[PDB]
Symmetry: D3
Subunit: 190 residues, 6 copies
Amino acid sequence: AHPISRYPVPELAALPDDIRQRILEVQDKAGFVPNVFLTLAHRPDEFRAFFAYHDALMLKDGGLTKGEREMIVVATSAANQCLYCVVAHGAILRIYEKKPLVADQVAVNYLKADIPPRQRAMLDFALKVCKASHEVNEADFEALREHGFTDEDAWDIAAITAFFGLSNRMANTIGMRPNDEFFLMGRVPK
Amino acid sequence: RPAHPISRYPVPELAALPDDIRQRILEVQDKAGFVPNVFLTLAHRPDEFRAFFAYHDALMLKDGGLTKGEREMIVVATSAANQCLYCVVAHGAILRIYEKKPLVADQVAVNYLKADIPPRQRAMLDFALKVCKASHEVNEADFEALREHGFTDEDAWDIAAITAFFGLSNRMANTIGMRPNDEFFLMGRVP
Amino acid sequence: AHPISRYPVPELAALPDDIRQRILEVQDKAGFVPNVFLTLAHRPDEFRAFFAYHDALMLKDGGLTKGEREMIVVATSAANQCLYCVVAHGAILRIYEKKPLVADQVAVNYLKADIPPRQRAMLDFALKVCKASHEVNEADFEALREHGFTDEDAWDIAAITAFFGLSNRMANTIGMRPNDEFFLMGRVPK
Amino acid sequence: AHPISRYPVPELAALPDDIRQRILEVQDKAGFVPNVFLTLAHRPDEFRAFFAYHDALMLKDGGLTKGEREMIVVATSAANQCLYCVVAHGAILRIYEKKPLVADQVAVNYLKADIPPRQRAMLDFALKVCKASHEVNEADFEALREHGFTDEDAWDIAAITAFFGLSNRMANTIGMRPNDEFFLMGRVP
Amino acid sequence: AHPISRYPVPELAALPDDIRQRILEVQDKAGFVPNVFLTLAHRPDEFRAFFAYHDALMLKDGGLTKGEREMIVVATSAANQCLYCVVAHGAILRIYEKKPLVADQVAVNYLKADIPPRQRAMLDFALKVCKASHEVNEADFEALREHGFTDEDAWDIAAITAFFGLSNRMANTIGMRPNDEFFLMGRVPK
Amino acid sequence: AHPISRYPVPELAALPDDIRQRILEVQDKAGFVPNVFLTLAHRPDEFRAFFAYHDALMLKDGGLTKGEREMIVVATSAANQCLYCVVAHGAILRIYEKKPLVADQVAVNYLKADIPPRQRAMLDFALKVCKASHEVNEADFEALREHGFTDEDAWDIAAITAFFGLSNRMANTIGMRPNDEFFLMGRVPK
């Protein structure tokens, strides 16, 4: 087995109960524990805040579909050359939208991915928040509204981009390894 | 003198907010004399507010190999690289206060390579900057370099975490037009 | 059926004998025709020279294994954000290496791929020929030689990088589309 | 004499005949042999594939003029800091255009070269293909059309950019040295 | 005390009297001698050429206000990450505009400083000369004219940018330290 | 005849006597007037300080030969893509060095110019001051000392680089044209 982190990966039995429950609850749904859970459990207080933030953005009722949210995470993680997040969320993207080819395209060159203008423009904003938020101006929000987004959708695209930047940096810094399961998941329909 | 807007987004009234959030805002006010705008602007999305400050507290309030000033120093250099006006200005004030060095935050914001800091701290910021702009390139030699200056790998995680979270903060700050309070600009400049 | 080129694509019948002969040869071996053949057959003389150059590099006897050559292609194409070549050779790399996870790693961040230092080094060089060839110097070759390569291997790396650099630009310019087959090919072992 | 490559340079004596032929042919219609032939003759198969592709682009009847083809090479090569190609095709550019100053301009900053907006628009594309092809969209082909180019012309511009990127990377990697003759050629009408 | 330069700082008594008078003139004007004077005096011919040029740009009567000229310096100095110039001219900018916040805003992100569109356009052009002067075209001048800048004002902007680009590089090369006084100057209005 | 500036070029009869004198002294010397003189004449106060700085550096006696000084200008100009300075000073460089090929080499890729390690090392420091002076450190000076350059020689390199970048920006902003004479000058010896 290849190491999943550069840092100590604690034993499920050594972890506090609430952390342990979130990990098991994810194993139940997924069938395995994604390595982000295990690797970030090295620092319990950060694990708690990381997933709290994650949930607040990814589980909320919002203008962005669950698929679109993961698509944001894939395009921005590509930009940061983040192995784990590209691979982990590429799979989920494929599942959530039932499009086996789309995550690959968004990761290699989203400019040429088989997605609609509304989504392309969604990502354009995400890439700007990612690499150059200092230049975010009113024309940027106008561009999103031209496609039916509200400014609250803008905040949403921005917040996902922001938080998965936190996550890409942590994953790259510790060499967080994507589970084998993610590499094939969502590629074969039905 | 009508005040400048602090966000391009709505700012809720302290009264129209959850008591837990209201209490955190009052605790910071009753200890600073004013409410930093990050609390009021993020209070537009209460669940994100709670998750932000909890993450913030986990890194900036823990016991650790980094001093309180050093942690703020990391924020200032990384924020300066992202050209985050709120963060550079807000955390420069706090850096000056913690270090008791009125000049250090401006040096770190403009070019930390010439800041009045020891090579241990310059090394710490070299790493922070790598995580900040090229984390995918982080390797074992980057950890070795920090260790050469007396850091442990647990300290290396603290640096990287702070960089990571304020890269989030920066991005939100910049997207919403988060405006630094007037008090930060002058705070810590007079010994 | 999405289009595979921004330019006209000719009918196999329409093409010269040797071109159709080369295309039939691959149709039979693979069970389909990669789009690169069809889309470049729009300009018969360039097709001829493109594939002659390709064969001279990828079919020669040499110090790089077939899978190492494809590895060079995935890492440099990722650099040029070439959807066609990343996806296409990504599949081919998985076949030759019998490693289903490697092509994704090489395409996203080859610095974290599951490859030995000799292969990392081979890629470090390729990446310099790709993005900064004017800086290539004697110490670059000396670095390779310390990993066991010969100067003739180094040329091979450089040459693959040069040629696929050409291919990336043609692919990208015309929006050459990777075949659906390539996205799953090599991910489930035989 | 300075070395023309960091790699071995075969003797014409020991080369396949078809390769000697094109070298000895160059020696007549030029009086000397550009180092690109001799340096790439180290690998005969690559030599053959390389010149065929070159001839396929540069010698075809097409929408771009001979001089315009060279102008694309000089500008893209200049962007890849390719000493060999900038200098060698700067010369040929001067010979075709009969304009001794144009290559230098195209090499330093084509944006200020003495050329009409049509040729500048063309080179704007060439430089997009050169450094950011993944971003090439319909608006780029539309831009060229406004100056009277067709999409076939765009392909030719892109293919020249693509090929000389190969040529540049090879030059740069082996230290291919421009012949002395190229530095002065075409500077006197 | 911290050294103000990597190089020797000549004593007054040792300097040519004309050079000594400019230094003593500013001592009276400011109440201290900015380290630019003291440190460049190491090379008297250059001190003369330098301050002559400075005065030709910053003392001329012309299109740009005195605060506007300082704004160009701080924003362009911020982009060459010049510690000395950013800090020194930020101080002056605060005084001339009577706006204690505007310098830090211009230094970090002029796009978000409290300045009219005219001043933003001005600095857009300054930053183009500063980082990409080779791309300066007629559309650049056209944009400026829309805000009230003549071609002679555009020259002034470019000229300031260019000269302070020289200044930044000497400051940066020698470690030209800013005077303690500039850090606090202009923050509490008179 | 192509315009030599985007701005007015004054007639020498219309200029101050000292300015007309300098302009006729160079004509005496060169047999033509470099367009830098005529175009900057548009601003006599700046013309004076500009040529006063130029002389302070280019005419001084110091550790750099006259050729090496031009070589710094051509390498750094080239990096600012300054048509005027590259072409003009390339010509001068050919003269001073009696090396017809050397300026082209330095202009395109100095890393491959026919120059010894000492000169390559002087240009490495020049390009650093040119594009990243904020990162100049004690090790860059040490690198120059190993090649025999003194503290004052380093200042000369840094100073020429700084001043010619002011020149590049000004040439670039006004579309300063180089004279037909510089294009062929020095390419043929004796």
